[PDB]
């Protein structure tokens, strides 16, 4: 979480600095082509928070959803977790749509730029972090609890699907 949550943070900040210290989504847009490196960075990190298979979020979020489902909790405890995964992903797609996709609802002076070397390098090390760390750490850390082997299928696949509608 520290990896990709931060990773999208300065990427948002890189957008904020480039687009004249503006924060509302309703003034973003059309930044996909004009903000290339950040566009990839935010796009990955947006659903990296949701954690597609084989990622920092995969070995944590998907296992978390199964683990609470594959345990003894109150009836509503699980439902909030799936609601969390769906609701988080829905706006995780939203902020991309307003920011990069669409049309540049921004002032006519086209200052938008991210050519600063420190800008690229600072985020660059967080691409490799936000994508590689989950795999390497998971095999680098021995398991602590009993693994969930014999499992009735759907409550694991539910975590992946509840992300997409």
């Amino acid at each position: 979480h520290a990896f990709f949550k931060a990773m999208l943070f300065m990427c948002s900040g890189s957008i904020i600095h480039s687009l004249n210290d503006e924060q509302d989504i309703r003034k973003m847009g059309g930044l996909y082509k004009a903000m290339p490196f950040t566009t990839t960075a935010l796009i990955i990190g947006s659903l990296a928070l949701t954690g597609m298979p084989y990622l920092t979020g995969f070995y944590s979020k998907d296992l978390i959803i199964e683990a609470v489902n594959m345990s003894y909790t109150n009836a509503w405890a699980l439902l909030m977790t799936l609601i969390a995964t769906s609701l988080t992903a829905a706006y995780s797609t939203r902020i991309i749509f307003f920011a990069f996709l669409g049309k540049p609802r921004f002032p006519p002076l086209v200052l938008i730029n991210e050519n600063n070397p420190l800008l690229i390098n600072s985020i660059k090390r967080l691409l490799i972090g936000s994508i590689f760390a989950g795999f390497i750490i998971s095999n680098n850390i021995p398991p602590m609890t009993v693994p969930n082997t014999t499992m009735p299928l759907y409550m694991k696949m539910t975590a992946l699907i509840v992300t997409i509608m």
Binding site: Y72, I136, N139, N140, P142, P147, T150, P152
Partner: protein, 122 residues
């Protein structure tokens, strides 16, 4: 899920109670039921300093996992058959619990309607 419906929206006695079952002698119904035996002795778990929740019957494979892992350093892409034995052991041990769950389930199923049969014949 399905058993949740059979207890909450169905009959609670029909489904096993996870915090109370089993409620019947396991040897009863299986004359000479062999004991689920231990592979890794008490000192094996003790010397390995394994944690209690992972000190189950599968811990015999688990110590093998760490030992290839503690010797697979540097590499982390090795150590594949070790878990293949471990998770299969946990896969079958979870089945053993599942079988015990269904055993108590049909234990509750059989006797309740058997007593209902008595209630019908009187």
């Amino acid at each position: 899920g399905a058993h949740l419906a059979r207890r909450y929206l169905g009959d609670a006695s029909k489904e096993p109670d996870p915090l109370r079952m089993p409620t019947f002698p396991p040897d009863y119904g299986f004359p000479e039921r062999k004991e689920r035996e231990m592979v890794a002795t008490q000192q094996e778990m003790n010397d390995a300093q394994l944690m209690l929740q992972q000190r189950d019957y599968c811990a015999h494979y688990l110590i093998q996992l760490l030992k290839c892992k503690r010797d697979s350093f540097p590499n982390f892409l090795a150590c594949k058959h070790e878990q293949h034995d471990w998770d299969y052991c946990e896969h079958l041990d979870y089945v053993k619990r599942m079988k015990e769950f269904e055993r108590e389930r049909r234990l509750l199923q059989r006797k309740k309607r058997r007593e209902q049969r008595e209630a019908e014949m009187a």
